[PDB]
Amino acid sequence: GASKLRAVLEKLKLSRDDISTAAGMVKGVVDHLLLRLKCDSAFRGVGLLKISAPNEFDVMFKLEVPRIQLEEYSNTRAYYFVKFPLSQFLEGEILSASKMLSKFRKIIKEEIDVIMKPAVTLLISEKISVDITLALESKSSWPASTQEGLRIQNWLSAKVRKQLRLKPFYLVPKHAEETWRLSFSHIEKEILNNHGKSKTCCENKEEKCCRKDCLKLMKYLLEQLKERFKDKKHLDKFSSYHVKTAFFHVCTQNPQDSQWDRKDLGLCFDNCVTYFLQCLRTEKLENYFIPEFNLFSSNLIDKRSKEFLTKQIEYERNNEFPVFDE
């Protein structure tokens, strides 16, 4: 379906000045929050670690904490308690996510045409929504639950996995409670931008793969379907993170750049859609870094919404995506 999909990618490029100038003011607001945040004892040394869905922007504020100790919350491989001026957020020996997240919020309140709402949400001039997520930074080795994650050996190399896992990891105050959740959104950006088996993937005309186009098509497929099913709101829980995560699994499944040749955009997209479909139908989408953390368990998304999106994605697939027409 190259023609139809290439037309879609060409349509998306048309809003490139909208995504830029809208994030162009996200910038000057985030720098302003960063300035006065660095004036508070607890948030000194905070710094910047972007577009989720047209006009939905995400910024992560990283904060360097001293040596950190993690206790896995129950058997949820992603959620943890945290222990070691930061002393003010303590609940005994653990560091209170809910309480730290709370002072963050209030410092941004007195700093704010912007208005409020793990994410603190701003609204710049009504159109532009910004997610501002506080991230604790740990330079310790990654937690045990990531040992079998990041299965990039056959795709990027074994040595690249070793380089990636020497980098810090992050905890956002997202409670399953004073609990924090692992974050590797910095690693997600690295493997997205440095995505080939060939180190020179997409640096010359002989190596133009279609990995990034497939993810765009997949993000756009979900955005369009979510728009169409706005009457009965069955798709509210699915995000482009479910799409990005599935796209990482397909990259692991098709590790060679030859499996992402631009000429094959139609078949590559089909691989992304079929694997996403298998995830919905088996109620299993593994976090790329934490395999025993199922983003699609009936815990997070009930079975009816998943069965719903299957049928729609299945119909779209079997009919050469009429959602992409005209």
Ligand SMILES: Nc1nc2c(ncn2[C@@H]2O[C@H](COP(=O)(O)O[C@@H]3[C@H](O)[C@@H](COP(=O)(O)OP(=O)(O)OP(=O)(O)O)O[C@H]3n3cnc4c(=O)[nH]c(N)nc43)[C@@H](O)[C@H]2O)c(=O)[nH]1
């Ligand atoms: N976006 C995102 N999701 C991630 C990441 N790593 C794991 N996940 C998990 O993927 C699922 C997709 O969620 P979403 O993006 O559609 O929405 C998530 C989350 O569900 C929502 C908060 O909803 P809540 O449960 O009602 O509240 P919460 O428990 O967060 O409240 P509190 O903070 O008081 O505890 O927020 C979205 N979200 C999650 N993490 C982030 C993040 O880092 N940035 C932004 N902008 N939004 C986020 C979910 O199951 C999710 O956990 C990951 O890196 N990104």
Ligand SMILES: [Zn+2]
């Ligand atoms: Zn490439």
